[PDB]
Design an enzyme around this catalytic site. Structure first.
Site, PDB file in Angstrom:
ATOM      1  CG  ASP A 124      -2.017   1.035   1.131  1.00 23.26           C
ATOM      2  OD1 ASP A 124      -1.960   1.906   0.236  1.00 23.26           O
ATOM      3  OD2 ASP A 124      -3.010   0.887   1.875  1.00 23.26           O
ATOM      4  CB  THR A 125       2.096   3.380  -2.781  1.00 24.98           C
ATOM      5  OG1 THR A 125       0.864   3.491  -3.502  1.00 24.98           O
ATOM      6  CG2 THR A 125       2.956   2.294  -3.386  1.00 24.98           C
ATOM      7  N   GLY A 126      -0.163   4.153  -0.387  1.00 24.59           N
ATOM      8  CA  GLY A 126      -0.916   5.218   0.269  1.00 24.59           C
ATOM      9  C   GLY A 126      -0.788   5.220   1.781  1.00 24.59           C
TER      10      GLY A 126
HETATM   11  C1  LIG Z   1      -0.982   9.291   6.674  1.00 25.78           C
HETATM   12  O1  LIG Z   1      -1.802   8.347   7.366  1.00 25.78           O
HETATM   13  C2  LIG Z   1      -1.834   7.145   6.724  1.00 25.78           C
HETATM   14  O2  LIG Z   1      -0.904   6.777   6.004  1.00 25.78           O
HETATM   15  N1  LIG Z   1      -2.873   6.334   6.893  1.00 25.78           N
HETATM   16  C3  LIG Z   1      -2.936   5.065   6.157  1.00 25.78           C
HETATM   17  C4  LIG Z   1      -4.110   5.097   5.171  1.00 25.78           C
HETATM   18  O3  LIG Z   1      -5.246   4.764   5.530  1.00 25.78           O
HETATM   19  N2  LIG Z   1      -3.879   5.966   4.166  1.00 25.78           N
HETATM   20  N3  LIG Z   1      -4.584   5.934   3.243  1.00 25.78           N
HETATM   21  C5  LIG Z   1      -4.398   4.916   2.199  1.00 25.78           C
HETATM   22  C6  LIG Z   1      -5.703   4.149   1.987  1.00 25.78           C
HETATM   23  C7  LIG Z   1      -5.757   2.990   2.979  1.00 25.78           C
HETATM   24  C8  LIG Z   1      -6.334   1.745   2.308  1.00 25.78           C
HETATM   25  O4  LIG Z   1      -5.683   1.558   1.042  1.00 25.78           O
HETATM   26  C9  LIG Z   1      -6.067   0.645   3.128  1.00 25.78           C
HETATM   27  C10 LIG Z   1      -6.912  -0.456   3.113  1.00 25.78           C
HETATM   28  C11 LIG Z   1      -7.941  -0.554   4.044  1.00 25.78           C
HETATM   29  C12 LIG Z   1      -8.889  -1.562   3.919  1.00 25.78           C
HETATM   30  C13 LIG Z   1      -8.739  -2.541   2.942  1.00 25.78           C
HETATM   31  C14 LIG Z   1      -7.756  -2.397   1.973  1.00 25.78           C
HETATM   32  C15 LIG Z   1      -6.809  -1.387   2.091  1.00 25.78           C
HETATM   33  C16 LIG Z   1      -9.721  -3.513   2.781  1.00 25.78           C
HETATM   34  C17 LIG Z   1     -10.926  -2.867   2.519  1.00 25.78           C
HETATM   35  C18 LIG Z   1     -11.277  -3.044   1.181  1.00 25.78           C
HETATM   36  C19 LIG Z   1     -11.416  -1.951   0.319  1.00 25.78           C
HETATM   37  N4  LIG Z   1     -10.925  -0.698   0.944  1.00 25.78           N
HETATM   38  C20 LIG Z   1     -10.167   0.185   0.161  1.00 25.78           C
HETATM   39  O5  LIG Z   1      -9.730  -0.236  -0.915  1.00 25.78           O
HETATM   40  C21 LIG Z   1      -9.746   1.416   0.693  1.00 25.78           C
HETATM   41  C22 LIG Z   1     -10.080   2.548  -0.292  1.00 25.78           C
HETATM   42  C23 LIG Z   1     -11.596   2.625  -0.485  1.00 25.78           C
HETATM   43  C24 LIG Z   1      -9.554   3.886   0.237  1.00 25.78           C
HETATM   44  N5  LIG Z   1      -8.285   1.359   0.940  1.00 25.78           N
HETATM   45  C25 LIG Z   1      -7.717   1.886   2.101  1.00 25.78           C
HETATM   46  O6  LIG Z   1      -8.449   2.423   2.934  1.00 25.78           O
HETATM   47  C26 LIG Z   1      -5.237   7.072   2.976  1.00 25.78           C
HETATM   48  C27 LIG Z   1      -5.306   7.996   4.017  1.00 25.78           C
HETATM   49  C28 LIG Z   1      -4.231   8.829   4.300  1.00 25.78           C
HETATM   50  C29 LIG Z   1      -4.329   9.784   5.311  1.00 25.78           C
HETATM   51  C30 LIG Z   1      -5.481   9.864   6.085  1.00 25.78           C
HETATM   52  C31 LIG Z   1      -5.587  10.770   7.057  1.00 25.78           C
HETATM   53  C32 LIG Z   1      -5.409  12.075   6.812  1.00 25.78           C
HETATM   54  S1  LIG Z   1      -5.839  12.876   8.199  1.00 25.78           S
HETATM   55  C33 LIG Z   1      -6.384  11.542   9.016  1.00 25.78           C
HETATM   56  C34 LIG Z   1      -6.249  10.488   8.199  1.00 25.78           C
HETATM   57  C35 LIG Z   1      -6.544   9.012   5.815  1.00 25.78           C
HETATM   58  C36 LIG Z   1      -6.466   8.095   4.774  1.00 25.78           C
HETATM   59  C37 LIG Z   1      -3.012   3.913   7.160  1.00 25.78           C
HETATM   60  C38 LIG Z   1      -3.161   2.582   6.424  1.00 25.78           C
HETATM   61  C39 LIG Z   1      -1.719   3.901   7.976  1.00 25.78           C
HETATM   62  C40 LIG Z   1      -4.197   4.122   8.108  1.00 25.78           C
END
Ligand SMILES: COC(=O)N[C@H](C(=O)NN(CCC[C@@]1(O)Cc2ccc(cc2)C/C=C/CNC(=O)[C@H](C(C)C)NC1=O)Cc1ccc([C@H]2C=S=CC2)cc1)C(C)(C)C
Ligand SMILES: [Cl-]
Ligand SMILES: [Cl-]
Ligand SMILES: [Cl-]
Lengths: 99, 99
Positions: free
Chosen positions: A25-27
């Site tokens: 997960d690059t995000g």
């Molecule tokens: C900088 O903080 C982070 O890196 N947070 C990370 C993170 O959530 N960052 N984000 C990347 C998206 C995370 C993830 O790929 C991670 C993920 C979560 C659930 C699953 C797969 C992957 C299974 C659920 C199935 C389908 N879900 C998704 O595909 C969702 C998408 C609909 C967005 N995927 C995800 O939510 C996006 C994101 C980034 C920042 C923020 C924040 C900004 S301010 C407060 C939060 C929220 C979301 C993490 C994993 C450490 C909590």
């Protein structure tokens, strides 16, 4: 390897002698795994995702193999929906995005 | 390009006549953007991440340009904390993970 994104980029990791599946997960800044046991002391961390915040346990300097590539770094453990390998470890195994 | 993962992989996208910054997220099935207007039909969707679910509007067949690469796909719009480009559009610009 080169991994295309037509399917979820799920890989096998090894941690604490056990195989698990995790998502590359690059995000994600950080790596977060589902509940498990790890050695040593942990510190608190709050991490934010799409749905809000969760509390996790932070363990440092943990050995973890990702697709057979060795890394040693910070692993968070908590109520995540899936195991996720974030940039902290993706950088250790020399991952880049290319197009 | 080759995008390093030392930092967050942010890019400029062009969508609905607007320029926005978004995160290239190999862990995301879907592309989700903060509240904005898009043309055409939509339907409601719940999407889940760390911290639980949010409700979004799903718009299909939306043109987008990402780092100069044109694509078309489904875009979700709602109260996401940050703009994320997911696999449904990453595939179309030929984005791969490499290590
Ligand atoms: C900088 O903080 C982070 O890196 N947070 C990370 C993170 O959530 N960052 N984000 C990347 C998206 C995370 C993830 O790929 C991670 C993920 C979560 C659930 C699953 C797969 C992957 C299974 C659920 C199935 C389908 N879900 C998704 O595909 C969702 C998408 C609909 C967005 N995927 C995800 O939510 C996006 C994101 C980034 C920042 C923020 C924040 C900004 S301010 C407060 C939060 C929220 C979301 C993490 C994993 C450490 C909590
Ligand atoms: Cl680390
Ligand atoms: Cl799509
Ligand atoms: Cl391809």
């Amino acid at each position: 390897p080169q991994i295309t994104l037509w399917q979820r980029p799920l890989v096998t990791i090894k941690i604490g002698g056990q195989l698990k599946e995790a998502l590359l997960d690059t995000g994600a800044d950080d790596t977060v795994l589902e509940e498990m046991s790890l050695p040593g002391r942990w510190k608190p961390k709050m991490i934010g995702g799409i749905g809000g915040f969760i509390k996790v346990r932070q363990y440092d300097q943990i050995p973890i193999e990702i697709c057979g590539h060795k890394a040693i770094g910070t692993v968070l453990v908590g109520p995540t929906p899936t195991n996720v390998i974030g940039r902290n470890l993706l950088t250790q195994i020399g991952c880049t995005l290319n197009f």
